[PDB]
């Protein structure tokens, strides 16, 4: 696995001194709007959305290797980040049509990789929804789309992070037991597909392959995987790609995310860090809305800081440096 010198340097900028991606995610758009609105039964303003991102960026990027932000609301937050923190910018439009099964990808209309680099990104993230068992023609379209982005990133010589969120065309709720029973296949086989050279991907941002709340020991109810089956799922994930890959939190609790990382490492996964969002900053939303900006700053300086510092200490003992998977050429 061979990176250009420039892509290597950009990847170093979004990583810590140990060659692990210990990154903070806050590119949420519509999702954040709804999280805020619940506290007042009316929509937040643009100013409120931009300001909360600034606060999270200011207060927590001294403790992260980089931050992921959206162009729509996150550009002030990007400017406010710690000098040693790198920047990722999201390139996809959010979401999908709930009434079709295809969940096709679409880039933000005002952007190109070139423009995202010009705006200060060290790396570009694109989220793709993918069902490996879905309509083959849909998946041809998806593969073609990713090839285009991979080619843009090759030309602009900037790292391409592909985020894969799995789904099943036939299952509505990804939190269900029914989905838990197919998730390992969905996650690991999608990674296999997108490991092909033709997609130009530098880092995969992926789900852990199991739903941990259904793993023996973690399960309060039905158990879908034994501890050993879950461990096998992590080994199979590691075997599904030679690219660097990192985990998203999926908004699980800080404690569960920490436990998942420990479990992953014990099983044999050599994951290369995380792009961790809600698990770190979730509690700031209510404080910001109800108590205001300085109160939210104080939450970030206490509870947020505790969350991210605990994450960093887990990462030191669980994550593997990406420099061991990749070299310059």
Contacts with a copy of itself by CB under 8 A: the residue count is: 23
DSSP 162-220: EEEEE-BTTBS-TTSHHHHTTHHHHHHHHHHHHTSGGG--SEEEE--SS-GGGBTTT-S
- Does residue 96 touch a copy of itself according to CB under 8 A? yes
Given a contact cutoff of 8 angstroms between Cβ atoms, the answer to whether 272 and 321 are in contact is yes
Residues 224-243 contacting K ion, CB under 5 A: 242
Consecutive H or E run containing 295: helix 293-299
- Single out the residue of 5, 43, 104, 118 in contact with a copy of itself (rule: CB under 8 A): 43
- Does residue 128 touch a copy of itself according to CB under 8 A? no
- Single out the residue of 2, 98, 136, 221 in contact with a copy of itself (rule: CB under 8 A): 98
Consecutive H or E run containing 88: strand 86-90
d(CA 206, CA 214): 19
Provide, rounded to whole angstroms, the least separation between the CB of residue 314 and K ion.
18
d(CA 56, CA 108): 24
Provide, rounded to whole angstroms, the least separation between the CB of residue 186 and a copy of itself.
18
Residues 276-315 contacting a copy of itself, CB under 8 A: 286, 289-292
- Closer residue to a copy of itself, CB minimum distance, 28 or 280: 28
Given a contact cutoff of 8 angstroms between Cβ atoms, the answer to whether 91 and 116 are in contact is yes
d(CA 73, CA 123): 18
Provide, rounded to whole angstroms, the least separation between the CB of residue 268 and K ion.
11
DSSP assignment letter at 44: P
> What's the Cα-to-Cα distance from 278 to each of 121, 156, 165, 252, 304, rounded to whole Å?
22, 31, 16, 8, 10
34 binds, among K ion, a copy of itself, none (CB under 5 to 8 A by kind): a copy of itself
What b/e readout covers 259-280, taking b as 16+ CB neighbours within 10 angstroms? Answer: bbbebbbebebbbbbbbbbbbb
Q: Which stretch binds a copy of itself (CB under 8 A): 36-44, 67-75, 135-143, 252-260?
A: 36-44
- Single out the residue of 97, 110, 220, 222 in contact with a copy of itself (rule: CB under 8 A): 97
β partners of residue 66 = 23, 86
x-marked contacts with K ion along 75-104 as a string, rule CB under 5 A: -----------x------------------
- Single out the residue of 62, 95, 217, 251 in contact with a copy of itself (rule: CB under 8 A): 95
- Does residue 65 touch K ion according to CB under 5 A? yes
Tell me the backbone φ, ψ of residue 233, rounded to 5 degrees. Answer: -60, -40
x-marked contacts with K ion along 294-323 as a string, rule CB under 5 A: ------------------------------
Residues 75-94 contacting a copy of itself, CB under 8 A: 93-94
Given a contact cutoff of 8 angstroms between Cβ atoms, the answer to whether 49 and 32 are in contact is yes
- Closer residue to a copy of itself, CB minimum distance, 96 or 145: 96
- Closer residue to K ion, CB minimum distance, 19 or 200: 19
Which residues make up the interface to K ion (CB under 5 A)? Answer: 65, 86, 242
Which residues make up the interface to a copy of itself (CB under 8 A)? Answer: 30-31, 34, 37-43, 93-99, 172, 286, 289-292
């Amino acid at each position: 696995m061979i990176l250009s010198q420039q892509k290597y340097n950009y990847l170093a900028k979004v990583s810590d001194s140990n060659g692990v991606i210990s990154a903070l995610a806050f590119d949420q758009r519509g999702a954040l709007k709804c999280l805020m609105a619940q506290y007042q039964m009316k929509e937040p303003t643009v100013a409120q959305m931009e300001e909360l991102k600034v606060l999270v960026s200011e207060e927590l990027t001294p403790y992260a290797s980089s931050i992921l932000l959206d162009p729509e609301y996150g550009l002030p937050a990007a400017q406010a980040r710690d000098r040693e923190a790198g920047l990722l910018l999201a390139y996809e439009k959010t979401g999908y049509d709930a009434n079709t099964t295809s969940r096709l990808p679409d880039c933000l209309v005002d952007w190109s990789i070139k423009r995202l680099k010009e705006a200060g990104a060290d790396a570009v993230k694109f989220l793709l929804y993918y069902d490996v068992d879905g309509d083959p023609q849909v998946n041809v379209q998806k593969q073609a789309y990713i090839e285009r982005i991979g080619s843009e990133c090759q030309a602009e010589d900037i790292p391409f992070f592909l985020e894969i969120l799995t789904y099943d065309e036939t299952i509505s709720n990804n939190s269900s037991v029914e989905f838990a029973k197919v998730k390992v296949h969905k996650v690991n086989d999608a990674m296999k597909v997108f490991s092909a050279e033709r997609f130009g991907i530098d880092v995969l941002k992926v789900e852990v392959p199991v739903n941990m709340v259904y793993v023996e020991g973690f399960a309060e109810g039905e158990v879908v995987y034994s501890k050993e089956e879950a461990a096998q799922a992590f080994r199979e994930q590691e075997a599904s790609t030679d690219l660097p890959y990192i985990y998203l939190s999926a908004g699980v609790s800080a404690e569960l995310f920490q436990e998942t990382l420990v479990f992953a490492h014990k099983a044999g996964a050599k994951f290369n860090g995380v792009l961790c969002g809600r698990a770190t900053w979730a509690g700031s939303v209510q404080v910001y809305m109800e108590e205001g900006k300085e109160a939210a700053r104080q939450w970030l300086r206490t509870s947020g800081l505790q969350n991210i510092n605990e994450l960093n200490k887990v990462l030191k003992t669980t994550a593997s440096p990406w420099t061991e998977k990749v070299s310059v050429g």
